[PDB]
Design a protein around this ligand. Structure first.
Ligand code: HEC
Ligand code: HEC
Ligand code: HEC
Ligand code: HEC
Lengths: 294, 108, 294, 108
């Protein structure tokens, strides 16, 4: 009977300018509450939030993904590995009250796109049409990756997301942003010196810094450097696997290459599990607050 | 000046969070990603000894004062094309006022 | 040979969207620094700024106006009449630093334009082309009106600005904004309850509130109310003049009429002395932050 | 609680600036341009005796939610189109944080 089909249906009478305003609402609030997490901002946690809801997708049965926008219910926002994402949720709620018409799925995914652009990252094409589904469509626990693992688990996990080595290494560039919170995931510290700015520093720090495997106060093991940075085991595995290493080395030299690859891979991640109609409008490219004079 | 003075206690709070990871303000202090900021006011752009800046910081060549510093911190990549420093920028005036005030005393 | 000719020359390669971005910068700073003057904002001082520099115009020899515009250099900055307008200049200079291409005159008037709209006033068409002018042509002091005077003085003064009865009553409506500062003008108090939002309260309070002639702490006599409001003698002279009285009560009952009359009048004011070539683009109507989702 | 509390002192200084001219928080206090707000929480829109609300205010008829009444101060036009209250609106959460806290206690 085939896996279920999710068709993208645009909100009634809504067009580009309407979604550009939602962008501006999120892009303003980022500049507005800048005190979050010791002045890191809500930027990184919104990128993870877009990744977390889209990381529930299973290509085999087409279950999960950003379509349903079912991230709101007791089952999936109370998990162990989503800890700290409630802050990203509370962030988008006053904005959703402003635009009650927009779907939860489109709001979350856009919130990820908005954050990356306003952090001076690459332009990420964004499509609408995600439809909110009843609570019976909510996925189960454990469809998101464990941080303590090797390169094999990483490659294996992302196959379920239909992501290849090229796309997964690009996507990991986002771990240069924000930090790990011991109170949340059981790991502590940032990955580099620029948390709120989108850069290729992730790949640079990975092979440039000297890493030592130590124990944090949660008794978990992470790779720490003298500069005070940190790397998850799944992150350090990218220079462990020779195939992953060459791509790490490449993004370190070419940031522009990294930006273009990330943009496609991130959009694909956000668009996984959606069937776009032929009459659907071309992907929106949103204007940053910097281009609007702000 | 047209650029006022704010709390240096709040400016340090901004510096510890948004600056200290790349910089140090103490005399003879260590460089990290960015150059040491001690005595930055009344000095030239990119003349800190021993470390490699980009071509931009020299070919801009501005004396750092309380005015152009504020202009540089609102959009680092607008004011000086080609700069290394990766920073979101301070979009709030009081934030720039407080931080530079702290920088005023700290780099003495 | 005749009065001077001020030709509007559009800044090189600049269009509407460029000036829209300058609008946004000002409007955002209106949004941002709201603590000024006990949370009145920079709105009233910016529209008085655009007025004071456009009020230096003399139709007879074509001296002054916003073409220069007459603010930007030293001597007349220190007039007894412009005290308090230094805060307006301090406001617009950081905006001029990220937009060095725009002329000082176009910036001052756009400040007035932006301030009105963001205060929920009418749309004011604004036209660029004002060109910077040397210090040798720099209109003197005493070319601006005095607050202690009667209706006849006002009608006579505004004839020099090419303004008629209907046009001056509309312009006077802007005095519903902000207040008088004893330190500055020798007068104290607001004209109504709403200082930072554009409304017809000026006209309503004029013929409704009970006014008393009272001496302030500067020994200047002003008309004070029981609600703590005030009117300049020049303002109160509008109901002291029967022909002015008719237009005052009109704007009181019809706010839309006043909004449209002020738009023409205020647009005419900043445009006084400017000769626009036929190739000059149609007057810009800028979008508010609220319209852009900002 | 869906909305977090703020300071009562800074909200007082914000109340005596942006509010007190139009408003009084005292019990049985007089309306001025706007109505007396005493007992505002636990009461719907426009039931205060003696004041004339344009029907638009008596129209919506919603209890003041913490949580709504604070979304009022966002843009005092949108929520109830055609209202007579002239105000710029509170665009900063920290402003309504301090204000709605002060507007609780003084409303006893
Ligand atoms: C802080 C700056 C303010 C707060 C908090 C409130 N106001 Fe006002 N107010 C004014 C008028 C003319 C009205 C009538 C409303 C109408 O007719 O639609 C009001 C009403 C309110 C209300 C609602 C009361 C109701 O029964 O619906 C609230 C909650 C309120 N005000 C709180 C007058 C003014 C005013 C004059 C210029 C200002 C600056 C403010 N109000 C500001 C505040
Ligand atoms: C991370 C990287 C940062 C951050 C977060 C900040 N700065 Fe500092 N900075 C950094 C680099 C790599 C450079 C060199 C850029 C170049 O060579 O063109 C700088 C430079 C400056 C300067 C110029 C003075 C000088 O060259 O010595 C200043 C004044 C400066 N940086 C200040 C500053 C402040 C106040 C910051 C936080 C508010 C800040 N930077 C952040 C590296 C980084
Ligand atoms: C495209 C983006 C993206 C992808 C893909 C991604 N992450 Fe992250 N993740 C982030 C960002 C950004 C943060 C920082 C969020 C913050 O600081 O609030 C983060 C944070 C985390 C944290 C720590 C959160 C905390 O508060 O401590 C863990 C654990 C984590 N991610 C696990 C993973 C694992 C395991 C993978 C893959 C094997 C993965 N993520 C893939 C973007 C991503
Ligand atoms: C179109 C706009 C406009 C016109 C025309 C105008 N004014 Fe005003 N003026 C303002 C505004 C707005 C303020 C309030 C400034 C503030 O609150 O910072 C102001 C302030 C003043 C003040 C007090 C300044 C202070 O800081 O105390 C005086 C005196 C004054 N104007 C004189 C006049 C006189 C006299 C006339 C005409 C006979 C006039 N202005 C016409 C807009 C205008």
């Amino acid at each position: 009977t085939t896996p279920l089909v999710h068709v993208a249906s645009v909100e009634k009478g809504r067009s580009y300018e309407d979604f550009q305003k939602v962008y501006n609402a999120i892009a303003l609030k980022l500049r507005e509450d800048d005190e979050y997490d010791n002045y890191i901002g809500y930027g990184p946690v919104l990128v993870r939030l877009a990744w977390h809801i889209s990381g529930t997708w299973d290509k085999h049965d087409n279950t999960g993904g950003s379509y349903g926008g079912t991230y709101r219910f007791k089952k999936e926002f109370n998990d162990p590995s989503n800890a700290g994402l409630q802050n990203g949720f509370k962030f988008l709620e006053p904005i959703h009250k402003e635009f009650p018409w927009i779907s939860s799925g489109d709001l979350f995914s856009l919130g990820g796109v908005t954050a990356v652009q306003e952090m001076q990252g690459p332009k990420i094409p964004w499509r609408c049409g995600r439809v909110d589904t009843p609570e019976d469509t909510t996925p189960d626990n454990g469809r998101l990756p464990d941080a303590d693992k090797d390169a094999g688990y990483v490659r294996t996990f992302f196959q379920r997301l239909n992501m290849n080595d090229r796309e997964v290494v690009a996507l990991m560039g986002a771990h240069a942003l924000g930090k790990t919170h011991l109170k949340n995931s059981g790991y502590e510290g940032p990955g580099g010196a620029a948390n709120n700015v989108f850069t290729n520093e992730f790949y640079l720090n990975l092979l440039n810094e000297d890493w030592k495997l130590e124990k944090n106060d949660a008794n978990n093991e992470q790779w720490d450097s003298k500069s005070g940075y940190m790397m998850l085991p799944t992150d350090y595995s990218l220079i462990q696997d020779p195939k992953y290493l060459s791509i790490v080395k490449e993004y370190a030299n070419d940031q522009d290459k990294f930006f273009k690859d990330f943009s496609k891979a991130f959009e694909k991640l956000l668009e996984n599990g959606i069937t776009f109609p032929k009459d659907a409008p071309s992907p929106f490219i949103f204007k940053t607050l910097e281009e609007q004079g702000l | 000046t047209e650029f006022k003075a704010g709390s240096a206690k709040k400016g340090a709070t901004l510096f510890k969070t948004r600056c200290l990871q790349c910089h140090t303000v103490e005399k003879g202090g260590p460089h990290k990603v960015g150059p040491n900021l001690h005595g930055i006011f009344g000095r030239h752009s990119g003349q800190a000894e021993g470390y490699s800046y980009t071509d931009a910081n020299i070919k801009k060549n501005v004396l750092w004062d309380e005015n152009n510093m504020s202009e540089y911190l609102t959009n680092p990549k607008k004011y000086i094309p080609g700069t290394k420093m990766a920073f979101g920028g301070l979009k709030k005036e009081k934030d720039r006022n407080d931080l530079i005030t702290y920088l005023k005393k700290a780099c003495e």
